[PDB]
Amino acid sequence: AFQKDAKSSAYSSRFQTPFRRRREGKTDYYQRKRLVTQHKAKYNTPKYRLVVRFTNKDIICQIISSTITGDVVLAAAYSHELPRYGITHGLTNWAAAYATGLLIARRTLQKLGLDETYKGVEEVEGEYELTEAVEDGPRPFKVFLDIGLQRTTTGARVFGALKGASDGGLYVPHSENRFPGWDFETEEIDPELLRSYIFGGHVSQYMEELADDDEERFSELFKGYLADDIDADSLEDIYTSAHEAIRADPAFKPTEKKFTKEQYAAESKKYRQTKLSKEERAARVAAKIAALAGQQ
Amino acid sequence: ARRPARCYRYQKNKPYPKSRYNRAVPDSKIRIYDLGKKKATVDEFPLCVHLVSNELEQLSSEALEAARICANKYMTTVSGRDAFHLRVRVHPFHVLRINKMLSCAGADRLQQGMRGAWGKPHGLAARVDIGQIIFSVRTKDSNKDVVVEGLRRARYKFPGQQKIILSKKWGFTNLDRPEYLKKREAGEVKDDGAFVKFLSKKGSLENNIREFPEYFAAQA
Amino acid sequence: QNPMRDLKIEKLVLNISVGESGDRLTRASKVLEQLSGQTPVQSKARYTVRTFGIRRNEKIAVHVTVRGPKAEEILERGLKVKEYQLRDRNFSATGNFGFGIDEHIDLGIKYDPSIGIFGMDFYVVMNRPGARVTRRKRCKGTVGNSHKTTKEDTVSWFKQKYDADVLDK
Amino acid sequence: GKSHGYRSRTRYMFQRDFRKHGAVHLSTYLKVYKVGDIVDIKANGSIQKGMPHKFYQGKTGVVYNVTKSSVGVIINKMVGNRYLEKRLNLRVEHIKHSKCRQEFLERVKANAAKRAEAKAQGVAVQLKRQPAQPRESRIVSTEGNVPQTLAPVPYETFI
RNA sequence: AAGCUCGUAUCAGUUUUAUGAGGUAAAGCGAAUGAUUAGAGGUUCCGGGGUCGAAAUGACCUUGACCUAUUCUCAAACUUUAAAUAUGUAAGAAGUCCUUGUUACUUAAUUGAACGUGGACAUUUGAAUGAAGAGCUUUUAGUGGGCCAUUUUUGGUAAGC
RNA sequence: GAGAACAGAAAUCUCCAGUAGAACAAAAGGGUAAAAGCCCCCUUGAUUUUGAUUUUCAGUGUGAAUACAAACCAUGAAAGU
RNA sequence: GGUUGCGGCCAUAUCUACCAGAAAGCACCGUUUCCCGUCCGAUCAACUGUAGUUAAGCUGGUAAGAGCCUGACCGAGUAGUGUAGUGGGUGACCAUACGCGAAACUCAGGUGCUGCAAUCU
């Protein structure tokens, strides 16, 4: 209700407007262009990219290509299906992204049909390594990261899926100086601390941190573990049992989803307001000019 | 100097205005453009005979200054100062350049020929198009006879064959004379200082009620 | 119709402008160490004046900000010196107010004549539970008109507490 | 003196646009360029790298070289009294496909489309593009449309 | 001038179809920047000058500026729009379609990119008109003071400047 | 534009509007907004080899520039530069 | 048909002022041990959807809305311009013939479409 500024018609005329995906602040196009431009000598070979966006209590992970008509998704992996594998809680922790990382990396291979090779690492000791090319065989799948708007800080949850993608049978170019525990004073790396973070060490150490110091803070959070009778000593066992469970059958069994589309569609138009017709526009302004400007 | 206007009568150059590249330009000779009863309202002066030029030429500020004095001095003494609203509708923008050769015995010292002949500004003259309206009188119907002759006495001081035409349509605002009378009582007229603000059908309804009361009620 | 929406303190900022450069800069900066409990930072000039005795980049004054539940307890201590009295004006159109006082010694702490008299100033910013939208990194929006803080709102929200008068007219 | 610089007399020529400023969209990069494709030149002032000389603007050439982030084109410059084969290497934002050529592409298959029908039924090819032939004899109607007399308007100034 | 290789191959100081590029003419400045005339509505404590008033962020005016809706006239070094003339390219057999190989490039992938292997499309083979034939090579005389006219325009008032 | 003792118009702090009306070493013109403008971490790719192309052009040099090849690097998590 | 993630075109979606959003999701939100950066966990960093929300963000509807776009025998064959004449006029400049053909104004309408994947009483 600030009419003092009174942005003129001239200002509203020559105002250049940003792109729709930028006007709403969802895409940084300075970084975007350098990530999608394929080598022109490669002709019609797509450059696949992997997105990781951390929304509230959920993680976005999918393999997506690009096209003039629009970006094309190859495979998808969501946090909501981790309870099916056995990860019922902790959907937005650092280790949760890694669990999806093994899930997303493995899932693309089945539909590709090349999962027989490039198994990644199955022991997971937290050590740095890439999925090296197999001699006398297909080259390893390469895919880049997509972060966009959350700042690159070491220990970020985005790099949890990076380890999962890297150790899940995919090749992603990445370095060690941003993982959760890489020393800043020197080039030292401690995979042992990473091995805890990969397997939920951070949450597990905070389990006993409240189990002896203060119970009311422990009680008000962690409601599910108390209700489901899960302790810290079994917390890591969940993730260890999770990893091989993902590789058992990562077929992305779709939900029964209940009902059908039309009743979902029917529930919308029955309550959503429609447009207005020109006769309705003329009718009310005639009524308004009669009721208000007609002087009773 | 003030060489005869026969040199600058004709449009012989591109427009050369007073811009940041145009410094040290002499001031315009004409000082006041609108004169008479400038505060007069719109409906008080139904008639205004214009004065239109016929050909392409440039009219200098001195010519505009001399004509305005001649026109104003006439109607003020016979019709009275509170009888007309005279306006000048041309502004001197083109700048006149001279080469400035001295008049004494030169050659050996005068200008070393016409080398670098670009000159310095001498005056400021307007640019007049074909059929472009010059002047406007805004008089009353009973005063047409005096005013028309007054513009006749002023057309002599311009260079050219400019003519006077019996104008129409309340020649202070646009839109035809019989149409203006139709909108005088219909309620599309707001009595504003000098000019009159018309009615719009595309703005918001709420604000229009305030300044335009006698359109939506019974009125007359 | 009063949901969880309400008015609450966003931050409290402190400022001590200094007339010149020298030892008194460090003397004034260290005052905020024992008041805010935190480390104050530097505020630097923008251009030279040549008549105030200051010039370009000479670190004229310090400042510090305090937030959270550890911010309001400073407020009433500052309000003691004014006898809990405010003015009709001193309230911004964006629902914020402040006040500047000298002989800060009335706020507490021993006089310590090696310290002197410092005119530390107050300014407190108020917002609502959800004004984060203007500070976010993804999908940065703007505060709604019906949700923005207003001068009438901050005065109204201030009046039901502290039983303070408004004086003047 | 006189200025004959590389980008001289370019003041309304390399302007980005009105109300279309800012970074270029991503559709210009996602198009596939192959050797031997007719293109057009429109210099983009957003990024000066790989930008053609002011002489080349709207000129049409053939793609012969495709490097990592640039495309090579050939321009038949007319200098003196002859044509010289000038080779230019330009980035992908100062170039766009010339859709004058593509119209010929479906014309090839359009003639080929009814080529099969022509031999299926018999002769009657008539696939050469005829120009705008003169109109043939047609009759007009007066029932419900009567001629309206018109006369030149008498002069009146209305000013 | 000497010619040379072949002969309607294909080329054009031209038109059309399709498709680009170009900011001059025009137009606009109740659109940006400059100007630029004259009023109407509020505003000045963070402006000054008159009545009253210790006294002002006091009651009443004005002066000089701001904001709002207007109004008269312009820009080679102003601009949203945007001509006419002129200008780039294409109108295909060095072409298209189906199967297939090589490559040390590229690709996750005999998947991509260059060219050929086998088969089909012939005289409306796929715009108009014209073609004392098309293309190619060597050598060298003279030439490097120009002027005038329609059209556009620069300097100078103007000039057989 | 709204506010803070000195502090007032130019001392330092906070909020709103703000397509940029600022700033990009030095002329003028284009270009630039999670940027080419502010500041901060690392670094000398301002490296080696000799080709090709554009402007002035005679299509010769010269100055400037353009995109690439075969090495070794700087940086960023990486695409990339 | 709604919502989210990634987009394509990219103000027929921008802006101003109001009203509405059971459904899932969006966002606020609660916590300061481990990572991390700030004076300030306010942004950024980490933890469970826990204690309430739909107030805000976002989406949707309206303005005789400001702008944008579209169309018009509306302005207007107007201005301008290619070709031509021992055409007019001293001169400026102007008509005619064969062609091309604007912009401002005025009026009327609209004021987002769409791809990939998941999901949503």
Numbering used by the authors:
A (entry chain BF): 2 to 297
B (entry chain BK): 1 to 220
C (entry chain BL): 6 to 174
D (entry chain BU): 2 to 160
From the reporting publication:
Ribosome-associated quality control facilitates the degradation of incomplete translation products and requires dissociation of the stalled ribosomes. A central event is therefore the splitting of collided ribosomes by the ribosome quality control trigger complex, RQT, by an unknown mechanism. The RQT complex of yeast is composed of the ATP-dependent Ski2-like RNA helicase Slh1 (Rqt2), the ubiquitin-binding CUE domain containing protein Cue3 (Rqt3) and the zinc-finger containing protein Rqt4. We propose that the Ski2-like helicase 1 (Slh1) subunit of RQT applies a pulling force on the mRNA, causing destabilizing conformational changes of the small ribosomal subunit, ultimately resulting in subunit dissociation.
As before, ubiquitinated trisomes carrying these mRNA constructs were incubated with wt RQT or RQT with an ATPase-deficient Slh1-K316R mutant (K316R-RQT; RQT*), as well as purified anti-association factor eIF6. Subsequently, the reactions were analyzed by sucrose density gradient centrifugation. In contrast, when analyzing the samples treated with wt RQT, we mainly observed post-splitting products with almost no stable disomes being detected anymore. The majority of particles represented various populations of 80S monosomes and a substantial amount of 40S subunits as well as 60S subunits carrying a peptidyl-tRNA and eIF6, together confirming that splitting reactions took place.
